[PDB]
Amino acid sequence: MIQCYQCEEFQLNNDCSSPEFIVNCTVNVQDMCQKEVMEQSAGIMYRKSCASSAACLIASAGYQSFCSPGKLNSVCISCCNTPLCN
């Protein structure tokens, strides 16, 4: 019913867009998707994986959620309740 894309390997390519990484996180525990953005010498990395309700609140409630595109420590956190958010 509701699935999400999980990507533990942060790479600077478009390979992280396959339907094989899409998992059906229907379990009460996790029912949302997690997305993160990072920037370093290597390039622009991004973390993704199945998130949960309680966790989703953490990021939101957690101040300093916003970020900037032109910042070395450009840390961004956010989740989604819709399927295939990433």
UniProtKB/Swiss-Prot annotation:
Cell compartments where the protein resides: Cell membrane
Entry annotated with the keyword Membrane: yes
GO cellular component term, pick one: synapse
Record's bilayer topology term: Lipid-anchor; GPI-anchor
GO biological process: acetylcholine receptor signaling pathway; behavioral fear response; negative regulation of protein localization to plasma membrane; protein localization to plasma membrane; response to nicotine; synaptic transmission, cholinergic
Disulfide-bond pairs as recorded: 4-33, 7-16, 25-50, 56-79, 67-76, 80-85
Glycosites: 24
Primary location group: membrane
UPAR/Ly6 domain span: 4-86
UniProt GO MF annotations: acetylcholine receptor binding; acetylcholine receptor inhibitor activity
Keywords: Cell membrane, Disulfide bond, Glycoprotein, GPI-anchor, Lipoprotein, Membrane, Signal
Self-association state and partner proteins as the record states: Interacts with CHRNA4 and nAChRs containing alpha-4:beta-2 (CHRNA4:CHRNB2) and alpha-7 (CHRNA7) subunits.
Function description: Believed to act as a modulator of nicotinic acetylcholine receptors (nAChRs) activity. In vitro increases receptor desensitization and decreases affinity for ACh of alpha-4:beta-2-containing nAChRs. May play a role in the intracellular trafficking of alpha-4:beta-2 and alpha-7-containing nAChRs and may inhibit their expression at the cell surface. May be involved in the control of anxiety.
Name listed for the protein in its UniProt record: Ly6/PLAUR domain-containing protein 1
The organism of origin for this protein: Homo sapiens
Gene responsible for this protein: LYPD1
